[PDB]
């Protein structure tokens, strides 16, 4: 494809990304740093400040997850070629890509000490999350570890918009009916991402490779997360998970 096409594609994705996601990375980091006058997020460091504690956080993350799925689903439909895909594959691509994207974007809201929550109105410390009882205290730590390494790449919303699209158009998801169309689209997205990184990050070496590498880390983070939910289901008789997440998780990986 001509560079003009790839640039047009990069801009298209960035624009629909801005429309699909309320809190961008630019805003979040501005907040985390405090270079914006609106309201410094409330800091939740323990039980008193938060006002079972594990259940509330459980509900909090669950509610945010459901919103993200819908947001990601809307963004996917704006990717050239996606809606022209067999409906079944669209569902499959979303089924397996949403959590990888959720954790990718969760990184934009974290730093070595915490994570913005509730539209960026709150800031839950890492320490606090690691202190939750039973298996509840080891859910976020894996994400924080990932976040730190991922954020070191210093990607901006324009970089992320394409990366997320690349994750969605993965032709290796179990159950796909027509792999070729999906791979052709990802190919165009990959080239656009490569050009984007070269122009946006001229002094950063092998950034394209390091970013693609992160796609395998996301696989691990997702499987490890499912397993922890397996534990909870086992050690918490009253599991109960939102029906949408149940659907996405039914026979996942």
């Amino acid at each position: 494809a001509e560079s003009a096409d790839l640039r047009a594609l990069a801009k298209h994705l960035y624009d629909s990304y801005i429309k699909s996601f309320p809190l961008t990375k630019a805003k979040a980091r501005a907040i985390l740093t405090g270079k914006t006058t609106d309201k410094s997020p409330f800091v939740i460091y323990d039980m008193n400040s938060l006002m079972e504690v594990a259940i509330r956080i459980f509900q909090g993350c669950q509610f945010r997850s459901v919103e993200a799925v819908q947001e990601i689903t809307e963004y996917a439909k704006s990717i050239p070629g996606f809606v022209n895909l067999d409906l079944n594959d669209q569902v499959t691509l979303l089924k397996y890509g949403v959590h990888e994207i959720i954790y990718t974007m969760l990184a934009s809201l974290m730093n070595k000490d915490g994570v913005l929550i509730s539209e960026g109105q709150g800031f839950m410390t890492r320490e606090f999350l690691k202190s939750l009882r039973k298996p509840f205290g080891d859910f976020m730590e894996p994400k924080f570890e990932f976040a730190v390494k991922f954020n070191a790449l210093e990607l901006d919303d324009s970089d992320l918009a394409i990366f997320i699209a690349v994750i969605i158009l993965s032709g290796d998801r179990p159950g796909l009916l027509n792999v070729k169309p999906i791979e052709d689209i990802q190919d165009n997205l990959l080239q656009a991402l490569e050009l984007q990184l070269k122009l946006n990050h001229p002094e950063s070496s092998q950034l394209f490779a390091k970013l693609l590498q992160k796609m395998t880390d996301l696989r691990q983070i997702v499987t490890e997360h499912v397993q922890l939910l397996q534990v909870i289901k086992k050690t918490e008789t009253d599991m109960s998970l939102h029906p949408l997440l149940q659907e996405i998780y039914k026979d996942l990986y």
Partner: peptide, 7 residues
Amino acid sequence: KQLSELL
């Protein structure tokens, strides 16, 4: 089902 509707 929900994912189908969302789209």
